[PDB]
Paper text:
Carbohydrate-binding modules (CBMs) are non-catalytic proteins found appended to carbohydrate-active enzymes. Soil and marine bacteria secrete such enzymes to scavenge nutrition, and they often use CBMs to improve reaction rates and retention of released sugars. Here we present a structural and functional analysis of the recently established CBM family 92. All proteins analysed bind preferentially to β−1,6-glucans.
Soaking experiments of the CpCBM92B protein crystals with glucose, gentiobiose (G2: Glc-β-1,6-Glc), and sophorose (S2: Glc-β−1,2-Glc) revealed a binding cleft within each subdomain comprising a Trp-Glu binding motif, again implying three polysaccharide binding sites per protein. In each ligand complex, the glucosyl unit stacks with the conserved Trp with the O3 and O4 of the sugar positioned by hydrogen bonding with the Oε1 and Oε2 of the conserved Glu. In the binding site of CpCBM92B subdomain β, the protein is observed to further interact with the glucosyl unit through the guanidine group of Arg955 with the O2 of the sugar, and through the carbonyl of a succinimide formed in place of Asp959 with the sugar O6. Indeed, only 45 protein entries containing this chemical group are currently reported in the PDB45. In our investigation it was found only in the β-subdomain of CpCBM92B and it may be an artefact of protein production or crystallisation. Collectively, the binding modes observed with the ligand complexes reveal the possibility for extensions from both the O1 and O6, presumably enabling binding along a β−1,6-glucan chain such as in pustulan, and additionally binding to β-1,6-linked glucosyl substitutions in, for example, scleroglucan or laminarin. The crystal structures with glucose-based ligands provide evidence for chain-end binding to the non-reducing end of a ligand, with space for potential extension at O2 and O6, which would additionally permit mid-chain binding to glycans with those linkages. According to the crystal structures, mid-chain binding to e.g. β−1,3-glucan or β-1,4-glucan would not be possible.
Residue numbers in the entry: 887 to 1011
Amino acid sequence: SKTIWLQGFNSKYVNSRNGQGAMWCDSDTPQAWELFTVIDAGNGKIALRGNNGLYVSSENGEQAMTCNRPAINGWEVFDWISNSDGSVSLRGSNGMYVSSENGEQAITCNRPAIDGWERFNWAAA
Ligand SMILES: OC[C@H]1O[C@@H](O)[C@H](O)[C@@H](O)[C@@H]1O
Ligand SMILES: OC[C@H]1O[C@@H](O)[C@H](O)[C@@H](O)[C@@H]1O
Ligand SMILES: OC[C@H]1O[C@@H](O)[C@H](O)[C@@H](O)[C@@H]1O
């Protein structure tokens, strides 16, 4: 039921970009576009509903990640990985990890391992 924000390796916050184009980890402070409702999608999987009421997609790693899907299936469910330092990682349905890409390009879900860029600090809004 909880609304959260996600802070990437570069200290900026994950931004839905209002469903226009790709998501970026580029905002200074968490505001409306940086808030995501965590959705229990069944069997330990989660989805994320953005400010626009649409759902985050891995895009199967074929393009940068987006927040424009009107319904959850799948590319829209993720494993919520709880890391030892209290950070979170997200694993898409293709087995790859959501990456802030250090804010140098739009967010992706095509990297097979958790490194610095794939670990997010988070908090309930
Ligand atoms: O306040 C709503 C949104 O406005 C946009 O102009 C900013 O880029 C977002 O970071 C913010 O969440
Ligand atoms: O379409 C596949 C997906 O559909 C969703 O409605 C389920 O909750 C997911 O766990 C499933 O992988
Ligand atoms: O059905 C698997 C996936 O197919 C894609 O074409 C859709 O854009 C995704 O939203 C969906 O989860």
